[PDB]
Amino acid sequence: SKVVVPAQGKKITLQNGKLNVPENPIIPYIEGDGIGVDVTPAMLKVVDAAVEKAYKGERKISWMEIYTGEKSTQVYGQDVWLPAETLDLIREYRVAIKGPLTTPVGGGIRSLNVALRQELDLYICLRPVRYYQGTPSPVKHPELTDMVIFRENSEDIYAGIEWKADSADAEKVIKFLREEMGVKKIRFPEHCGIGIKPCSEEGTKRLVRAAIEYAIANDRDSVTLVHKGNIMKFTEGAFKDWGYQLAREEFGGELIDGGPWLKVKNPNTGKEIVIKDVIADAFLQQILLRPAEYDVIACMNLNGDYISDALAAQVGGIGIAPGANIGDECALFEATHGTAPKYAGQDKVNPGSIILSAEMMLRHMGWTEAADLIVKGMEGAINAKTVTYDFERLMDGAKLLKCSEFGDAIIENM
Amino acid sequence: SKVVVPAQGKKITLQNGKLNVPENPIIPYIEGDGIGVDVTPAMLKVVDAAVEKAYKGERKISWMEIYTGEKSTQVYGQDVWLPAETLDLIREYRVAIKGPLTTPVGGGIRSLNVALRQELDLYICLRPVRYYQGTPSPVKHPELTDMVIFRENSEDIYAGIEWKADSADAEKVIKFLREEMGVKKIRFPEHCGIGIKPCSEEGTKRLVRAAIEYAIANDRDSVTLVHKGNIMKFTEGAFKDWGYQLAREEFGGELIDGGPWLKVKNPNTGKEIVIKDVIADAFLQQILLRPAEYDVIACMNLNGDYISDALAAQVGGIGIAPGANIGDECALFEATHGTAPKYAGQDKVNPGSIILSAEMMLRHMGWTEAADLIVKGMEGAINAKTVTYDFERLMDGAKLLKCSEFGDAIIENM
Numbered sequence: 001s002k003v004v005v006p007a008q009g010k011k012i013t014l015q016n017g018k019l020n021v022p023e024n025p026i027i028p029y030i031e032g033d034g035i036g037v038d039v040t041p042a043m044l045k046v047v048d049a050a051v052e053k054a055y056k057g058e059r060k061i062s063w064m065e066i067y068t069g070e071k072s073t074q075v076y077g078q079d080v081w082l083p084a085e086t087l088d089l090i091r092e093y094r095v096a097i098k099g100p101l102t103t104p105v106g107g108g109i110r111s112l113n114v115a116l117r118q119e120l121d122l123y124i125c126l127r128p129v130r131y132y133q134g135t136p137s138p139v140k141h142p143e144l145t146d147m148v149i150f151r152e153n154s155e156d157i158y159a160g161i162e163w164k165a166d167s168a169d170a171e172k173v174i175k176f177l178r179e180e181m182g183v184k185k186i187r188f189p190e191h192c193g194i195g196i197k198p199c200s201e202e203g204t205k206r207l208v209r210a211a212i213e214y215a216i217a218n219d220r221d222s223v224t225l226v227h228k229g230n231i232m233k234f235t236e237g238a239f240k241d242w243g244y245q246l247a248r249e250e251f252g253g254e255l256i257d258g259g260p261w262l263k264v265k266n267p268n269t270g271k272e273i274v275i276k277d278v279i280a281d282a283f284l285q286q287i288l289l290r291p292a293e294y295d296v297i298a299c300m301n302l303n304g305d306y307i308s309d310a311l312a313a314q315v316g317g318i319g320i321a322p323g324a325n326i327g328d329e330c331a332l333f334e335a336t337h338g339t340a341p342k343y344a345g346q347d348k349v350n351p352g353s354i355i356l357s358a359e360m361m362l363r364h365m366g367w368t369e370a371a372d373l374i375v376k377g378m379e380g381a382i383n384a385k386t387v388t389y390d391f392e393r394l395m396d397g398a399k400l401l402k403c404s405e406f407g408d409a410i411i412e413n414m
Numbered sequence: 415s416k417v418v419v420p421a422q423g424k425k426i427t428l429q430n431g432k433l434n435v436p437e438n439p440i441i442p443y444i445e446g447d448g449i450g451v452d453v454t455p456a457m458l459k460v461v462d463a464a465v466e467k468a469y470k471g472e473r474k475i476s477w478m479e480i481y482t483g484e485k486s487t488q489v490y491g492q493d494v495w496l497p498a499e500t501l502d503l504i505r506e507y508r509v510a511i512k513g514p515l516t517t518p519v520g521g522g523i524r525s526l527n528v529a530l531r532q533e534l535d536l537y538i539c540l541r542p543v544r545y546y547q548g549t550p551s552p553v554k555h556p557e558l559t560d561m562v563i564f565r566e567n568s569e570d571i572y573a574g575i576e577w578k579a580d581s582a583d584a585e586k587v588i589k590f591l592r593e594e595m596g597v598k599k600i601r602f603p604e605h606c607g608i609g610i611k612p613c614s615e616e617g618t619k620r621l622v623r624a625a626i627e628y629a630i631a632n633d634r635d636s637v638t639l640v641h642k643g644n645i646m647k648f649t650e651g652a653f654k655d656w657g658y659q660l661a662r663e664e665f666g667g668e669l670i671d672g673g674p675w676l677k678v679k680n681p682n683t684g685k686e687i688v689i690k691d692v693i694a695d696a697f698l699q700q701i702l703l704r705p706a707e708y709d710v711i712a713c714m715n716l717n718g719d720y721i722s723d724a725l726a727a728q729v730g731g732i733g734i735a736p737g738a739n740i741g742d743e744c745a746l747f748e749a750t751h752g753t754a755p756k757y758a759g760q761d762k763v764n765p766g767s768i769i770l771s772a773e774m775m776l777r778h779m780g781w782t783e784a785a786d787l788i789v790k791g792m793e794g795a796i797n798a799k800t801v802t803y804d805f806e807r808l809m810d811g812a813k814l815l816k817c818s819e820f821g822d823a824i825i826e827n828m
């Protein structure tokens with residue numbers, strides 16, 4: 001009802017597991033709450049400039065705004081935070097992008113971001129994290145970090161299955177656990193909240209399957225299964241066993257030494273990709289202490305949230321970290337930072353995250369020239385130290401830029 | 415049967431919630447697997463020197479070795495990894511310490527460390543993390559970190575309640591969830607592992623209760639409730655609500671501004687302690703980016719493992735991080751690093767962790783003079799750059815020391 005389909009423009013289709021993108025594709029975008037009003041306009045202009053420059057006017061995106069979050073309630077009504085129409089629009093047009101989203105508190109509503117992921121079955125959360133020269137960073141050698149996180153996106157405790165302490169359901173579940181499953185380890189059964197943590201074999205293998213294909217298509221050096229399997233043997237640990245098993249079953253994994261690592265040969269470059277694993281709490285230490293040893297990461301939903309968010313901070317990219325939610329049929333790219341309501345509307349915020357997510361989106365569309373230009377623009381703008389206040393306040397000799405002006409700087413550095 | 419109670423020596427008792435420690439107390443200690451054979455002897459000698467120097471010969475510990483892990487199987491037999499006698503010994507003598515422990519794989523045995531914590535109901539995992547000048551660190555300003563972690567120690571998913579995919583129990587639980595609880599969010603119900611995540615109100619409030627008392631007794635600046643409550647509302651989120659509620663109910667918490675932070679007045683110094691909260695994935699970023707803003711931390715079991723282990727790495731103290739497991743009746747202090755089998759027996763390992771845990775143990779015993787001397791010794795030895803290989807290999811100008819020699823250096827710097 002209130003979305004306007006672009007007069008000129010054409011739908012992306014999926015054929016044979018491969019996107020068919022027209023030169024005039026319609027892309028759905030969600031402005032986002034808070035500073036989404038600042039960064040989305042910059043992102044539109046930066047992407048159009050990259051597309052115009054890479055294909056000399058032969059291609060062009062027909063943006064189409066759709067809604068989620070506050071703007072959805074002001075467009076559709078009182079408690080329409082995520083209209084069915086927005087899900088249908090993303091499935092019809094295959095590829096979309098959105099700014100920051102916040103979920104209201106006090107109405108029993110659970111994460112809108114996670115709702116999008118789970119209802120579009122975008123089981124890959126893809127966070128590439130690598131250091132942009134010139135970025136102010138808390139660690140000494142941020143340039144050693146160059147990883148790609150494959151975070152499982154629908155199952156784990158992150159999935160939102162839980163009962164409230166003292167509710168009839170929680171006490172029903174606890175009664176079933178103690179009396180029918182014989183559980184004795186619930187220290188205090190009264191006034192106790194309960195959460196469920198599921199992890200299946202198919203969900204594990206389609207997430208690791210994507211990670212290893214990614215290592216192959218991008219010739220990277222390894223895939224590390226991160227887990228907390230010595231405590232949670234049947235979810236985290238199973239994730240790690242199924243991941244190794246997939247590597248053997250579908251990518252000819254061979255045993256290194258006495259194990260447990262494997263090596264997968266890259267069919268296209270001959271490079272032996274190492275498959276290995278690290279327990280999650282030690283991994284949070286290793287990304288600081290021995291960052292160059294890691295590359296592609298495969299892990300479950302909650303660990304992936306932590307790991308992405310720790311890596312982004314340690315390269316000083318907490319505000320420019322790109323992110324994508326990808327499934328077999330649809331894809332939703334997103335700004336990964338908060339809504340920062342304090343500065344919303346002041347044209348202050350750093351648009352780098354949603355712009356790099358747009359870079360991912362173009363590359364997912366097969367428009368790699370335009371995507372390369374955006375990386376190149378971020379490269380030069382940040383290396384030139386012409387940046388927004390969240391960068392500039394941490395450093396000397398930088399030129400302070402509004403949000404919109406940083407978008408221009410990126411275009412100027414393409 | 416194989417433990418020898420010390421001829422001379424006397425049992426610590428608990429009276430009125432307060433330890434009564436004799437001048438000749440018997441302390442039970444577990445050597446620990448792997449490098450425990452290296453660091454425990456250094457720790458015995460360092461603690462005895464501190465006690466001898468602080469009390470001029472009037473006090474002295476009667477160590478008593480007890481067993482867990484490999485040495486237990488070689489002392490008691492084939493699969494005796496954790497003899498009942500060791501639990502009884504720790505409850506009889508109240509205070510003990512142990513080196514690194516590893517749990518065997520392939521026999522269905524779950525963490526020996528966690529078994530000790532849960533069966534002695536040591537619900538506080540206490541990790542103080544602060545930077546020792548001279549330590550090689552991956553970040554630029556490690557000296558800004560000075561935190562104390564209160565990690566909940568018996569409940570959360572960390573508690574080891576789970577079924578294996580395809581087992582009759584997992585399929586029984588999944589059937590109950592889908593058919594009797596109406597759960598629709600399990601993406602793939604087949605071949606799916608299940609874990610339970612419990613969090614009670616009493617468990618939350620006795621853990622936060624200890625954290626706030628600690629902030630009071632040590633005049634620190636704040637207590638931060640760390641959680642992942644926007645996704646797990648009834649466990650992580652409840653932990654955070656119960657924590658605030660305790661602060662109001664028992665420590666006169668008053669609202670700051672419009673909330674949600676509180677302020678608790680320190681009954682002894684008048685200092686207003688801030689009670690606040692941060693969501694766990696953002697917190698892993700904040701301990702890097704704004705570390706000076708945090709002090710005492712209160713959080714649940716799994717987050718506490720991650721947070722302690724990330725902080726230790728970021729001050730370069732991955733091998734000297736102290737740790738204690740404390741309950742209302744018993745206490746078990748521990749080395750917090752792995753068993754490092756590769757270097758075990760070579761007198762290489764860094765004894766700093768178990769020695770600082772001994773420092774905690776003495777201070778828990780009321781022997782604060784001896785504890786102060788050990789801190790002072792670690793201070794000087796590390797500042798003098800007379801350290802073991804894990805420090806020395808990361809730095810220039812250091813003097814390489816065996817494990818035993820570093821223990822001497824600590825004594826020499828008391």
Ligand SMILES: NC(=O)c1ccc[n+]([C@@H]2O[C@H](COP(=O)([O-])OP(=O)(O)OC[C@H]3O[C@@H](n4cnc5c(N)ncnc54)[C@H](OP(=O)(O)O)[C@@H]3O)[C@@H](O)[C@H]2O)c1
Nearest residue numbers: 100101102103319335336337338339340341349350351390
């Ligand atoms: N993945 C996501 O899209 C995502 C993840 C979590 C939360 N959010 C949402 O965001 C809301 C915003 O409000 P909050 O105050 O509660 O946030 P908050 O995350 O605790 O705070 C974020 C802070 O990071 C900075 N920042 C955020 N985005 C930035 C960007 N793009 N460029 C530069 N700096 C940026 C601002 O700090 P300075 O003022 O220091 O610059 C900002 O206020 C939350 O309630 C939440 O639902 C979105």
Ligand SMILES: NC(=O)c1ccc[n+]([C@@H]2O[C@H](COP(=O)([O-])OP(=O)(O)OC[C@H]3O[C@@H](n4cnc5c(N)ncnc54)[C@H](OP(=O)(O)O)[C@@H]3O)[C@@H](O)[C@H]2O)c1
Nearest residue numbers: 514515516517733749750751752753754755763764765804
């Ligand atoms: N809290 C605990 O007590 C605890 C926690 C987890 C694991 N562990 C156990 O430890 C076992 C040891 O074997 P792993 O090889 O599997 O360990 P791992 O933790 O993956 O490796 C630890 C590495 O840290 C270094 N290190 C460990 N303790 C140190 C110390 N005290 N001083 C200086 N450097 C230290 C050594 O690295 P460099 O060679 O680079 O120096 C070491 O091999 C594990 O299987 C596990 O059950 C104990």
